[PDB]
Point group: D5
């Protein structure tokens, strides 16, 4: 996988809160970023996942986390979808259009026989390093609550070097501090 | 990612419930499989994740799912770890040794500069197709309850071809049926 | 240019009169076809051109000519645009979705830096041979009265071998008979 | 197609109003140009098309548009054809000779098995960018009224940036202003 | 040079005595053939040479010799030239058109920067073997009388194996009969 | 052919009027040169052609023309031939030896399966440009009176850049002046 | 073999006397070193060979010899092995972990189908040159007292250039002085 | 290293007990073999090492073990050395000549800048598998008692796998 | 050198006792042959070496040895040389002409910068194997009596396998019998 | 062949008059040299040929000519052969050892399937140019009187070019 690799440069048009904007890797530098890939606008599993991310967007913003949804549809289609669907209408984050497929291919996430992105989510730190990846099949929906758990653990580990978050770790729980002494004890 | 691709052939030695055995791709044919990769035996986050999977192993076996944990350590080391850790001692699934790194590379999961596998989990169906992938960075532990939810959704979609599981789908909740009429109405 | 070349095989999904269908080269065998490329759904020049073709569609169906509009948007987007716009709602011909860009690339008509097709029209005969090409710039709209004239002249030449349509040919006007005696006489 | 590409440099001899001249890309800098390709001197469809362009030549010179007809015959042959035919004797524009096929190949317009150019027309702006393309089959003649309409729309779009000519645009008719508010409103 | 090599296959259109015909290498098999290349129709040195060949054509035919003049002009241009020039009007041999340049390139005789053939003449025997080559610069005219001398010597040598025609040989003169005895005597 | 190409550098030993000398391309700079190739010393057609050239050598020297006869034999063999043949004894021009075949290959005149040069003659001007080429088969002797006519025409055209020598042109006869008016009037 | 070659650079982690350290080729500069390779930790066989080197380690350190045992297991596994086994607990020299196989491949000692090192011992001098090598199959014991003898002989020849140690040489025994008069004398 | 690999085919001339013989890999089949490489005849460490192996040859032959000494010199040179040196005169095993260096290179044991073999000993089982390898520097002689101990260990593990 | 290699196939013309013949490797089968190379005919030096082989030619033929002298000159030149020189006139063996250099290159005996063979002699046995070679610079005479001695020794060893001819061996002298007991005895 | 080419640089050990020396191409500069190749020490044609060159060495040294015998054996082997054979004991010129075959291959004179040099003699002038080459089959001995005659001829043409 692309775990522990730096994101590549990109330049794309996006729809964000009634305006068209340009997004590049420079917008991600010094921020926490979620790249939320999905196959197509005006489809079925796709809106439900985007709406669930929209429900956590206020908290994600409080934690310094930007969200970028991405599909191979244009930014024009994203606006039409935002205006016609009550689930998409609640999106306040940038909806990137990747019709060249370049951003999708930067993340090795193209379904090359369909020209659509796979259901992949990537957590990117302020240095551009990918810290968490989740990929699901066409029919399996992703859950924003587990993404939030992971973002919080990735933020804790960044702030507490020398510590690690064990399995099932949540805010305000015991962390392991790797040492020679701890080797073979757990 | 390797999403919706077929697993590659392999032949590895494993430690399983007090004995050494060979595991190959033919042992996965006709069953649901979890390939759970981790970097090293006798470390820190690794046992909490493996123990957490062992706590759900009776439910996974009730669902027809086999677990294979994998690291680049040998099956001898897995056995020793199983005898010295209270957490590893509760594993009743196969602990695969991948000292050549071939199983890890099949899954494109090697840290080549370390000779250790990344913290990657793959859900593979009875036809050898990868249906869900999760990868986390060195200090971020995985959560088996999310793994189980994804296996159940993967089992549902395989059992109901014309249906899809939306975001946050749990057993019994409202599914979606992709069609011309559902386009843009969610 | 691709003039007097055979169309390449293709398999694409499309929206046509409230139903999703599959279109291939096999569906064009034995018929006259108009492949009407345009850059993107939900834009400005594209619907006016698509409406202009729709206006001349009864006349085209009487002449045995099938219309296939094409863009790199999906068929789901075409269905949504059909429901959203009164101009597009009057289209009774097949709206092909080409998210892979393959059908666009068969006609060497991709804007490779944009992932959008250019404004190009191809007249294709019952034997798969391109008999007329028209490409205009992003801001210049095409005119169906030109397309129909060229279509009728294409139909005359095929139904009358040994004759050729001179400049400004309309039904009932004089035609040339290529021969040795006529060389340099016009 | 070559739409929205820059013309390549060239150096060809030509016949123009009783004199032989050299034409290069430098002669088209700062002017609007029509490259009118045709297969061969002393044929049948070619003079009728060339005569039709000659008829609209005063109107083209008023709009700052230069005409350059092209074939793989030499300039000596164009001079002889000018003297031989009453249709060709009325041509006041430059008749380029392209025996090397280089100018034809710059426009990807060679019939490689015949050594003759196809019936293609290119509208080129003062900056060397192709704004309109028309290719017809050996027996189908082109119509200059179409060329002039496309030329006028090309001139409008360049002289009015931020506007676009919709389908069937004539001088005095309404134009669209691409914006976010207009996305999916037409 | 191409001396003593077999001619290559070719297929070209030609003007011959008021008709258009196809010429291939099969027309040359079992005959003596002269391939008379020249740069362009409607030029200056070119007609004078072709007319001088036309003056010897009756005798050439009496000797079983066919003539094929060749330029990169079309067979249509050859007809126009035949009708408009009193020198070309006297040509009774085939005037081949080589607009693809293929026949010219078979004989390594293209001026690649001009797309015109050089002033080259080739004498080909009934087995397709090139027995005499003459090439001159753009401004130097060829003389049919020396070509006739050469054809007659090539025919004599073919009929009298074991003999050779020395320098300046003409019909009814002494020939050398190569032998060991003759070595060093002349 | 090598018509209108520049001669390549060479360095060869020669026999000339009782002495051995080196001849290079620098010895041709500023003069008219005849490279007269033949297959072998002590043979049959070769001496008649060489003797015939020697009979015109005073006129050629009066015209500023140097003669170089060439074969793949050595300069030693040329000297011996010159001492034993009454015909070769009258040669006062350089007899070049080309045992390596390099001078012959420069002129693309080697029979590779024999190690002998073909019966080829090249006329080279003071700038090293080949202006006339003649090649004949093994048994067909060349005629020096035709060679002289071609040198004179080559000298005239070099001395009168805007003029050309038509077919059968001799010193003093009517020349042609290429222009727009002369096109198709001969 | 690698006899008389220089060791290659390396950088590995190790377990040494209760602490984790980094070892590189720079730690070997100016010292005598022993690289002691073995297939795997935690196997069922008693590690007598490693224990036997530990029994001789005080004497080796008196002779300025550093010991590095190497396997493809991690330094975490070595520490666990050291805590679990009485034989391994005697080890006071560095236990290098080589999970990438890179130190093992530098000594051309990898079993590529297993991902384990062979049972090879290399004696390295202060300039990095390999002076002795021993490789045995499983069950063929490597004797540490034969290793000490070899090291002592290597140290003797380094301190007495011009002398060589014959078969069975030990401190106090006679050496040979390579000379011309000694040729064929033993 | 070449540990646990099968020896490669070879064909060489040798001197043995006053006669010249040909030795190939077919002569090693079903026998335990010692390929004992050394750099050059008429030198110094080489005879002491070869003499030490000759002192243990009777014992090695009691263990079913054949010995082949190998250098890049010819079998002609080995015969001369056997007649002129008292140490070499004790050798009753085959002295293989390897002037092409082919046998030396099969064992990857050539000092390519000298055209001489390195001081390497290979223990080879009845199936052609290399079970023990020892290589020492130019100045360090090998010990035949250590070679015998390893050979006895190799035979024990062959007879009793897993103990 | 080419010692103990087999001769390669060849096909050359030759001068032999007033007639021209063809020589191939098949003419050498079953015979002893001498290939006697030399740079050139007709040079100023007296050809003593060829004359000396001619003085010994009756004896060589009695010994079943055929002689072929070879130079890169033609067989025509050899015949002329044979008529002009008293030394060469004594030659009754075949004088091979090698103008392609192919027989000379088979014996790796070409001076590539000269196109002449070196002064090399090769003795070839009835199976085509080269048994003796002698190469000298100019002025270092090749002695035919040393050539006879060498041939006699080669014939002796062919007829007495198991015997070798020592230094200075001649018919009647003692030979050596390669054996173990003879090792170090001479 | 290598006729009229310059000899290539080399560095080899040799036995000469009871001592071991190093010979390189720098030792041949400004001297006439004979490189005399033979297949193997302790054999048959080789000593008769080497002994015949030894019989003419005093004369060759009077002509300013140095002799270097070369085989793929070591300089150690040449010393042993010089002590054990009465024929070799007469040699006062350098016996070069060529175990890497590098000097043999510079003269393109290796029997690659034997690792032995062919019976080739090269006459080399003071500028390093090869002026005469002679090669004979395994069973045919060379004649030193013919080598001397050619050397005298080479010296005459060097001193008097064009006669
Ligand atoms: Cl990934
Ligand atoms: Cl993946
Ligand atoms: Cl096109
Ligand atoms: Cl185009
Ligand atoms: Cl040619
Ligand atoms: Cl040519
Ligand atoms: Cl090694
Ligand atoms: Cl090894
Ligand atoms: Cl040779
Ligand atoms: Cl040679
Ligand atoms: K490992
Ligand atoms: K798209
Ligand atoms: K043309
Ligand atoms: K020659
Ligand atoms: K050797």
């Amino acid at each position: 996988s692309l775990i522990n690799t730096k994101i590549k440069p990109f330049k794309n048009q996006a729809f964000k809160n009634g305006e068209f904007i340009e997004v590049t890797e420079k917008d991600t530098e010094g921020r926490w970023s979620v790249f939320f890939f999905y196959p197509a606008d005006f489809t079925f599993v796709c809106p439900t996942e985007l709406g669930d991310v929209a429900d956590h967007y206020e908290e994600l913003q409080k934690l310094g986390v930007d969200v970028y949804s991405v599909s191979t549809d244009t930014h024009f289609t994203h606006k039409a979808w935002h205006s016609s669907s009550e689930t998409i209408a609640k999106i306040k984050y940038a909806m990137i259009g990747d019709p060249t497929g370049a951003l999708t291919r930067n993340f090795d996430n193209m379904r090359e026989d369909e020209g659509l992105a796979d259901r992949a989510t990537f957590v990117v730190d302020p240095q551009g390093i990918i810290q968490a990846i989740e990929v699901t099949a066409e029919g399996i929906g992703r859950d924003a609550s587990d993404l939030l758990r992971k973002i919080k653990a990735a933020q804790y580990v960044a702030a507490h070097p020398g510590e690690v978050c064990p399995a099932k770790w949540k805010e305000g729980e015991a962390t392991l501090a790797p040492s020679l002494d701890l080797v073979g004890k757990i």
